[PDB]
UniProtKB/Swiss-Prot annotation, chains A, B:
Quaternary state and interactors: Binds DNA as a homodimer. Can form a heterodimer with ESR2. Interacts with FOXC2, MAP1S, SLC30A9, UBE1C and NCOA3 coactivator. Interacts with PELP1, the interaction is enhanced by 17-beta-estradiol, the interaction increases ESR1 transcriptional activity. Interacts with EP300; the interaction is estrogen-dependent and enhanced by CITED1. Interacts with CITED1; the interaction is estrogen-dependent. Interacts with NCOA5 and NCOA6 coactivators. Interacts with NCOA7; the interaction is a ligand-inducible. Interacts with PHB2, and UBE1C. Interacts with AKAP13. Interacts with CUEDC2.
Protein name (Swiss-Prot/TrEMBL): Estrogen receptor
Binding positions for 17beta-estradiol per the UniProt entry: 44, 85, 212
Positions of the NR LBD domain: 5-228
UniProt-annotated stretches for the region Interaction with AKAP13: 1-228
Boundaries of the shown chain within the full protein: 307 to 545 of 595
Note: Selective estrogen receptor modulators (SERMs), such as tamoxifen, raloxifene, toremifene, lasofoxifene, clomifene, femarelle and ormeloxifene, have tissue selective agonistic and antagonistic effects on the estrogen receptor (ER). They interfere with the ER association with coactivators or corepressors, mainly involving the AF-2 domain.
Amino acid sequence: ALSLTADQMVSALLDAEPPILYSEYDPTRPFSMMGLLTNLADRELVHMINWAKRVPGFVDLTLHDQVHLLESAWLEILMIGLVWRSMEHPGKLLFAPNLLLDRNQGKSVEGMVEIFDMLLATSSRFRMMNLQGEEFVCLKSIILLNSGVYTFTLKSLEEKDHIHRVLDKITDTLIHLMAKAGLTLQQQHQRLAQLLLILSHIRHMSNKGMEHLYSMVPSYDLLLEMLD
Amino acid sequence: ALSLTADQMVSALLDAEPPILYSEYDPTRPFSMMGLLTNLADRELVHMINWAKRVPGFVDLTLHDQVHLLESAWLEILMIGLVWRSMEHPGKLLFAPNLLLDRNQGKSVEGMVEIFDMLLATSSRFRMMNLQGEEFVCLKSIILLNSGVYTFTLKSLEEKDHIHRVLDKITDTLIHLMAKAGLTLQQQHQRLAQLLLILSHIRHMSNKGMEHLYSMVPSYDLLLEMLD
Ligand SMILES: C[C@@H]1Cc2c([nH]c3ccccc23)[C@@H](c2c(F)cc(/C=C/C(=O)O)cc2F)N1CC(C)(C)F
Ligand SMILES: C[C@@H]1Cc2c([nH]c3ccccc23)[C@@H](c2c(F)cc(/C=C/C(=O)O)cc2F)N1CC(C)(C)F
């Protein structure tokens, strides 16, 4: 992972990309939204485990650390995936190709429209920045590696050091993508910052979402079982 | 604000710095922690309003937008201030020069040790990066401008554009501080990213804190009254 060039990193992440899934409702039957959003989230998680295993550097970590990172990040990762898919559908969230929802559809569950609104605003922000596919995959891997790295022994010190070196490789890669796109050195650092600052909002959204779910979620054991 | 050089930006933010406050307990009397932490937070907020008014670009915004940004950011701002103060006190949080608390002292309030632990880990991270005073003030201003900018009309479009241009000026400034410190172009972009990625964790901490407080906070009106 640490010997990868920028191009190889990008290629590795594009190749790791999980599939776009479909919602499981009978489309011949009349139009629970929570049920739909929960089942879809559950199925995407399985694919997320597989994707994570293909992010360079991730399988170098201990099982326990892999679980911790996924436990911290999974909802952020679903949400960034959603916002990216939704980017060319103004005012709509593309949960699946057959489940494209507006804010009014979110109003049927108490507390949900607020979450839909934040996701829609993020998709809007991505649209305004003209986020590229290659930048998206970098950001999604940054979330996986970064979200739990501050909440973890000699092994632990080595693990954190490795995570930060891999994150540095992804930073390098982002800059290289922006240099290749023809941005000036100024523009490259400005855009890097703009992209990383959106991750704080994605964190925020995840916290607001987890709050909703706790008020009613993959356990450590399920993540461990799937990762192990 | 947008015509400022890097040096002028840094000078402006250092000059805006609020004071370090003292806790209000009688030190001759025997050692409520929540009361102490609440009163201190309340007094710091007043100074935060004043500090915010001196961040270049902030008073250019509408009152409503200034309030929204502070409403979103205030706990993140207190927390980054805390973590910065605590940096050269391993295992302790320097809430005030007369209130230096360890994790065990946090255990007296249910849910508080978890929050103390996350703050301590952030201070540890800052220590490992050797965070500079000049970088800290940049980051604290980034929090103010960024935390609410995704959760807000023609005026609103102009406001967001301005906020992002000011954020770009702070990104420029950070890079300039790192170039002046002698870091290579690679090191500059890596360190920029490392610093901005810590902001996601600060967001996380704030959400976890606000959760605690809601389960029991400055209203819009109080912030508005103080800002207006
Ligand atoms: C709207 C958000 C984000 C989201 C959801 N479902 C998705 C499917 C694909 C991509 C993104 C999502 C949905 C969502 C949901 F409605 C239920 C669960 C429950 C999962 C479980 O019980 O394991 C998870 C979700 F992500 N979520 C709501 C919330 C409150 C978490 F922000
Ligand atoms: C430990 C955290 C962060 C914090 C607190 N007090 C500070 C004073 C100076 C600097 C930082 C802090 C404390 C804190 C507190 F214990 C009560 C309030 C309540 C304020 C209000 O009611 O207006 C605010 C706080 F920041 N906080 C706990 C929590 C749960 C919010 F994360």
